[PDB]
Symmetry: C2
Subunit: 394 residues, 2 copies
């Protein structure tokens, strides 16, 4: 959740910097590191609104019923059945080729209308929701970068959270023993959340997708029948119906079937949005923080060095990703000790080249001893006391 | 089925014409009329092949099962589960973001493939058939134009049929008592019936359409998984599957759902082809006939005129459509009599202007006495003996 996340920046300062101003986008993480304070990771974990507002619904499959055909003789009048008074029904008026051998009198064209009742099928609804900047929640998380951490989904009593609305952006956070990071987070959505919609389908028992963040323009002009929250019936039922020509005095009525394919066509390469029932997640957004570290303290520098021998390599210094070396160690002897780390560049043994992200590495009780250092390029030798390993830097 | 059909031509001759050469397209009708013979209607009723050849099938909805995920550590190797040996299965290879907190060792990208089994759903097949000129059947129908007929779907022992293959186009036809129309019909398909296909869906209990005559090019490049007649499994299953990105070591697999809408989209305004189980109907085609009437005879001219009074109007001379006047009459007295018809143009009473399509109109037992005449333009008076009615001609 930070050595992991490919989207990792650092931020470093003069000791007499004490504000930092970042942007955090989603599921990027930043490691802030600063002279004589402990490196923190800050990151933006979640944007969402709970019970967002429902928008129009869309029919993806029509239920057609009661084909109604009424037709008049070519002088007589024009025809009507009065179900074109009603809604959630689809009606075409044609003229039918009418003679004698079709119960008429004059040879001519003999006005005809057929209507049909259009309802939507059991669970083939598609449902918008809209966001309100005033109701949305931005979640930043701080966690010290000491790596007395766990593996990628197990919390931690240092590792704290701050939740910002638009309307409240000024939390202070207690980092186990290290003191207080302050946060100030000017919220910034992305689009007009009156121009942006979470679109949902019904979970139709497959490996098929449920949900998409999508512009409110595109949604609103979709090719489908629609209503607002549980309404009478459907406007634009005719989007899903089509009529035959008239033979005689009958006129065929068709269901252009199931738009599910058609919609997921539309949505090709739109990536799916996320949802925890209540909580609707934005996929897009960022937030911009003033991270106030005038008030962190070091991991207890109050401790005596680990006996320089009793270390063994939990993890071989391995390439990190983000342009650092990281290593775990086990040190069997005494308990809470400050660790002796150092590394040096062939040529020059009397000068330490280790630039630590892991400033005052300790081995604690439960455990500890992850080290992240950045090293000059070339053949170096890394030392945790006497324990050593090679390193080449590219 | 001929005063009805908007698509009616006539053909008329010198008495010493005896061949006629027509084209008949489908569900157009021609009325041939000729000095001192009885007017016939000829027309092309049906083109079809029985049990046409099946082509590829197309899947309109996939059944996905057994998502199989296998992934390797970023030095280790590349990954395989061996279900990408198999077919009717869909496999993507990605690289997954792999670290320490994902059971690995090196920080890197750690080759992963997931496969899924793709079968097609209960009755969501789409099925071509192809035509063979050698196997197709062209049906012409002759029926005398005396209108001792019925109403638009009740046969008649005069009204005869001739069925032409490519390979046999020379029937002679016995018209009740009138003699023999000969027919010679040089068959002409339309498209290469190796470039033309009846496309079918499964009758999915709606007012939805089943069938379409369609070019074999378009069909063959459709966006769907396919097999030949009941095969192992499906090629191009991947047309209907799509994969998530890889989180960790898992990689999501999706069903782009139901192509029915998508296909009927494609087919918008293609009009539906027809099918009687065995018999597949072309919607397009025509056939070109030499109609040999050197051998028709008149309705029995052997009869005495109807008493000129005892006629009453079954149907008022009404506009036909096709540029003729048509009328029915009832004549209560004696029985088989030849009818006295005539009409005249204000100005000039001593000269008959009635040009009959209904040359030797009789009233028979069961019944009779439909008259179709064509009249010069202006105020005329039509007379069946003494019975009379006005006519204006435009």
């Amino acid at each position: 959740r930070c050595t992991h996340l490919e989207n990792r920046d650092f931020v470093t300062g003069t000791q007499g910097t004490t504000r930092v101003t970042l942007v955090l986008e989603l599921g990027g993480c930043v490691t802030i590191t600063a002279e004589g304070k402990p490196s923190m990771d800050v990151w933006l974990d979640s944007i969402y609104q709970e019970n967002p507002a429902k928008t129009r619904e869309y029919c993806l499959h029509a239920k057609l019923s009661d084909t109604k055909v009424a037709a008049r003789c070519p002088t007589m009048g024009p025809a009507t059945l009065a179900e074109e008074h009603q809604s959630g029904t689809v009606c075409k008026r044609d003229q039918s080729d009418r003679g004698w051998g079709n119960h008429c009198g004059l040879f001519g064209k003999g006005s005809i209308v057929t209507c049909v009742k259009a309802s939507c099928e059991a669970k083939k609804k598609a449902t918008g929701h809209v966001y309100d900047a005033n109701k949305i929640v931005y979640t930043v998380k701080v966690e010290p970068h000491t790596g007395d951490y766990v593996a990628a989904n197990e919390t931690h009593s240092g590792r704290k959270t701050a939740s910002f609305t638009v309307s409240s952006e000024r939390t202070i956070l207690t980092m186990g023993d290290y003191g207080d990071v302050s946060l100030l987070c000017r919220v910034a959505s992305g689009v007009d959340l009156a121009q942006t919609v979470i679109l949902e389908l019904d979970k139709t028992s497959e490996h098929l997708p449920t949900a998409w963040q999508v512009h409110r323009d595109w949604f609103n002009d979709l090719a489908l029948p629609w209503k607002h929250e549980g309404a009478q019936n459907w406007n634009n039922a005719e989007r899903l119906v089509e009529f035959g020509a008239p033979h005689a005095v009958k006129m065929d009525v068709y269901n252009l079937g199931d738009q599910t394919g058609v919609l997921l066509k539309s949505l090709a390469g739109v990536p799916v949005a996320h949802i925890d029932g209540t909580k609707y997640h934005l996929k897009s957004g960022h937030v911009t923080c003033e991270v106030g570290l005038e008030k962190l303290k070091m991991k207890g520098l109050t401790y005596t060095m680990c006996d320089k021998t009793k270390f063994t390599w939990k993890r071989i210094p391995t390439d990190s990703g983000h342009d650092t070396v990281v290593m775990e160690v086990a040190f069997s002897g005494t308990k809470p000790c400050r660790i002796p780390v150092r590394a040096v560049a062939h040529g020059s043994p009397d000068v330490n080249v280790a630039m630590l992200m892991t400033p005052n590495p300790t081995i604690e009780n439960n455990g500890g001893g992850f080290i992240e250092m950045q090293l000059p390029p070339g053949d170096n030798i890394i030392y945790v006391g006497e324990l050593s390993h090679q390193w080449f830097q590219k």
